[model samples]
Target chain A: GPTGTSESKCPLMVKVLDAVRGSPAINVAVHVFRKAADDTWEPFASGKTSESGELHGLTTEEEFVEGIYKVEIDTKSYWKALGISPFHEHAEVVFTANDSGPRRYTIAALLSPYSYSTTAVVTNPKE
Target chain B: GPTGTSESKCPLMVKVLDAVRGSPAINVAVHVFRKAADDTWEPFASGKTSESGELHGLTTEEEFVEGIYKVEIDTKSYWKALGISPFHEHAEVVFTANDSGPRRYTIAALLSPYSYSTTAVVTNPKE
Candidate 1:
């Protein structure tokens, strides 16, 4: 468990999809970080993707801050596990979080052998 | 059949991945467009995903323009094909195309019954 503000209870979810095979990227390692004003990134949470390619509630700590945040997927390791040459060693999404946002923030990564893409969205905060 | 600058010969590709089932979304329609100054979206090309979940070269027409462009996937039809209630009707990506960019642009979609995500990238112009 990680320490945080009241906002930390808000969830951070990530899902990794395999665009090449049109499937979920199971067991992918997902890492979360908070970026400081000095551009340094501090680890806040970590989890692994499930059979559905999702990692739910990386850290539901009490406090949360509004700032630049990032999610990095360990694609190299995932591909290595499959005995495939990695197209991209790692994939990341960097974005700004606002206090006015919803109950949960979701970051989704669509990955392929040679390339990848990502998107972030806010969902009901009450959930 | 569409007319374009020499850069248009470069490929614009797309793939649809189903995150929930961990599989490819077959036969999903993919549409491409170029954005004009008046904010009008001019249709540039169209294609469909394959058994492998990809649309290779939505258009191989010679010539391309450097400007804002978009790719919209007809997700509603895709979900309907599977008799599943759609979470998101359509997915669209708006980005800038650079003349100095590579030969190909790739867009990937990771979809779930309740949500979706995407990513785009540039590739070698030669092939």
Candidate 2:
């Protein structure tokens, strides 16, 4: 579930992995945003990662229509919990979501205190 | 005073200013570190900015000695307080400290969500 609502229209799955350590970035804050026609970013969804640093069903499939999407990681708060000064604060990934397509889309961010990269692709839950 | 002790040996002063809007960055986290001979950074001091976005007497005049000093600002946390996505998380300022010379040193950091700059210099308390 995301931060605010009980249900989602666009179902998105996210996982955060530490690029340097190659491990899960547990309990990190994950925020999703969509770009509006005027080139403004609006909040779409938000949540915290599980112990495994994953967020399942971030938004409903219908709720996540075609748009420019951005996901932000609260790297500062994450490293703060570990008692260290992180080199970077928030890491972001951007992609497009097509309407009436792909029942599920998966987003993964490879992160480190100093660097980060991300990927988003259409995913099929059943083989 | 810093995060832990009441008295400081180095007696450093810090002020955080917003580069974009030219205002104070109040209540932001400020962490200071010193690099060791082994190139390891050790925590020297930590504190939160006052309403005016400044930390006075961060460490005692004696506590602060010459070294490679680093100051890190928790940019993510500061943006979170305003309910926005910050372009950066932590911003760092690095400088060298010369021993047994200047009685007072002042550091100022100009910051934005995406950018930052810092300056450090020796100063005299009395005009």
Candidate 3:
């Protein structure tokens, strides 16, 4: 994906969707956490999906250093708001990043009442 | 999705992708398990993805009763075959089926060494 905006220099982004309704999951809450040196998760960024069912600008290329990061989606609230119950507490994607070189990451999740699936797309910005 | 052919009368389908290479996850093994009465998973069907990264005809409509199901992907073998090591023991997707009605399900997964995301598209087959 092409780098979007001047203000959006973050290396990480998320795309959330509602498969049941075949629509973008607007206004969904998302939290990005990075594992610290002491082996505990530290809050890195918190944001919500926009009209495009995406959240970006969480971290710059430098701040997104070599480490394991977790992207947590507040799926429960989204389901409950629609008067439906969901199986998982929240949808989470955890992986190691920036190991060899800094790469841009796009994480996407498709949500159902009792199920959800996620995918990641990693690309080298400098390449 | 249109029903494929006479040889394939099953309802379930899977689409797998390797996010690392941004290509179809060909020859990846997938197993579908149905939750049995005693709360144990009973093997329903198993197959490998094609060059298009899809596997279909897992279970017929008559055999697909109301129950929970799990689709397990052999992420280890795929990564290992590529001379790479992966983090997860395996990639698995769980959800309920045939509750409201007989629906066609398309389960798609995008896989990384240490990360994966999945999504589902449920369409009323008989409609």
Candidate 4:
């Protein structure tokens, strides 16, 4: 994928998840970052994936505008928290937001001690 | 499920997928309804789920103030669009949006000609 960010003019949402399939992890750190127009992603938000494998973050910055955005979630710590060897090491969930005031994007991540999956939910944007 | 809306003042995203694990369809109609504070859901907005299984909508209505809300997607028509024997039809995705503004909620739904799946994304709110 291109290192640059999405070229859209709307609000966007990004989420990071630490998933385990076989055995669930005890603790996992999740981070959200925005890939700028200049081919760079800045730190946007961070959190931990719950035992159910989910973390939430939104774009609340001034520079954020209507356009395409990206979200990242780190899962390496999730394995460490469980005191087990890292499964896949890290995982990322990327998606975009269209032109809307305020909307919702849903991301579903599936993780096993060895593999993971992610999905996005597109909703109405903010006012 | 409870007919009452959510109690959190967070934004949410719900996506209806016309998934055809077996085939694809054309001209599918998607509708979204909101559960109000009075345990009644009002018509919020409507749209169609894309081929990739995503629909973007926002809680622009002023009453969308802080608190949990419910999103509904009508998929019965999705199967009608394909003209093929409808597979496992009618999929509904339900999720909560934590307190966040201008944030993003991602909902992922899996639709096969027979079945489907869904996931939620938590984003930061608007400033």
Best by TM-score: 3
lDDT by residue for model 1 (A1-127), tens:
2212222454677778875455789988877889877789988877778888877756653545677878889998987787756656699888887777565777878775555667777788534
Model 3 DockQ vs. reference: 0.13
lDDT for B93 in candidate 2 is 56
Model 2, C-alpha of A67: deviation from truth (Å): 0.8
Candidate 1 structure quality by residue, lDDT tens digits, B9-112: 54677889875445788988888889877889998878788999988755644545577778899988987787767757799998877667635777888885
TM-score of chain A of each: 0.81, 0.80, 0.88, 0.62
Instruction: State the TM-score of candidate 2 restricted to chain B.
Output: 0.79
lDDT of 2 by residue, A1-127 (tens): 3332335533677778876566888888888888999888899788888878787656665566778777777877876787765544366655556655556666666665544545455555621
Could you report the DockQ of all the candidates, in the order they appear?
Answer: 0.06, 0.03, 0.13, 0.05
- Quote each prediction's TM-score: 0.49, 0.46, 0.55, 0.44
DockQ of 4: 0.05
**Candidate 4, position B33, lDDT:** 56
For model 3, residues B29-114, the per-residue Cα lDDT tens digits are: 99988889998889988889999998976667777778888888888789999999675446667677888888778888888886
Q: lDDT (CA) for every model shown?
A: 0.73, 0.67, 0.77, 0.49
Which candidate do you rate higher for DockQ, 1 or 2? Answer: 1
lDDT of 1 at A72: 88
Q: How does candidate 1 fare on TM-score?
A: 0.49
Per-residue error at A72 for model 4, in Å?
18
* Highest DockQ against the true fold, candidate: 3
Please tell me which model should have the higher DockQ, number 2 or number 4. Answer: 4
